[PDB]
Amino acid sequence: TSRRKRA
Amino acid sequence: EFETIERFMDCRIGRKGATGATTTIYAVEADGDPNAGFEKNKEPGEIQYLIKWKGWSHIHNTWETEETLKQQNVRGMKKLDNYKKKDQETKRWYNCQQELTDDLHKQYQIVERIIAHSNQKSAAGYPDYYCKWQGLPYSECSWEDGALISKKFQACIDEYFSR
Ligand SMILES: [Cl-]
Ligand SMILES: [Cl-]
Ligand SMILES: [Cl-]
């Protein structure tokens, strides 16, 4: 359950 | 839903627009620092705050202005009023202490150990990994994108699958 910072 | 500020990590005068997603340590490593070579006496600058977000580990910290915080309707805005008051009564009033603090903050962005992996993999074949961060307790572990973790912490992936 991961995420990355996206514009 | 919206994001929530957990903690104000730092403050700077930085290049106008050098905020948001392009300022995470992994965006900086891939595309260069949006604030690189900024000299406040040579170009427009603005006050920027380094934010630790609720539910996101320290590798996802971003620089933000009061404007970007208000525009994204972030929660925890009371902490901004609180940090601004604390910052002003520090300038009126150490370098070895600030350096020590900074080194510590850098450690929170280091994977010490991987302790679990997702059954599902991305189209690129990466699972997500549950990470233990250097200098932080196990309560601060987080699920992270395997492709991101493999860039700098392949040795932690290798140790986890060696067991
Ligand atoms: Cl593949
Ligand atoms: Cl792969
Ligand atoms: Cl294993």
Determine whether the interchain pair B148/A4 forms a contact, defined as Cβ–Cβ distance below 8 Å.
Answer: yes
d(CA B57, CA B72): 19
The resolution in Å comes to 1.6
- The CA-atom distances, in angstroms, between B120 and each of B123, B127, B138, B148 are 10, 6, 23, 16
Tokens (6 digits) for B116: 């679990």
Tokens (6 digits) for B36: 């690189």
CA distance, residue A4 to nearest chain B CA (Å): 7
Determine whether the interchain pair A7/B118 forms a contact, defined as Cβ–Cβ distance below 8 Å.
Answer: no
Going by C-alpha positions, the residue among B108, B104, B121 that lies closest to residue B157 is B121
Question: Residues near B90 by Cβ (< 8 Å), separated by ≥ 6?
Answer: none
Category of B129 on φ-ψ map: left (φ > 0), alpha (ψ -120 to 50) or beta:
beta
Using a CB–CB cut-off of 8 Å, the residues of B that contact A are 20-22, 24, 26-27, 56, 60, 62, 118, 128-129, 143-146, 148
Domains, chain B, ranges and CATH?
Answer: 1-93 (2.40.50.40), 94-163 (2.40.50.40)
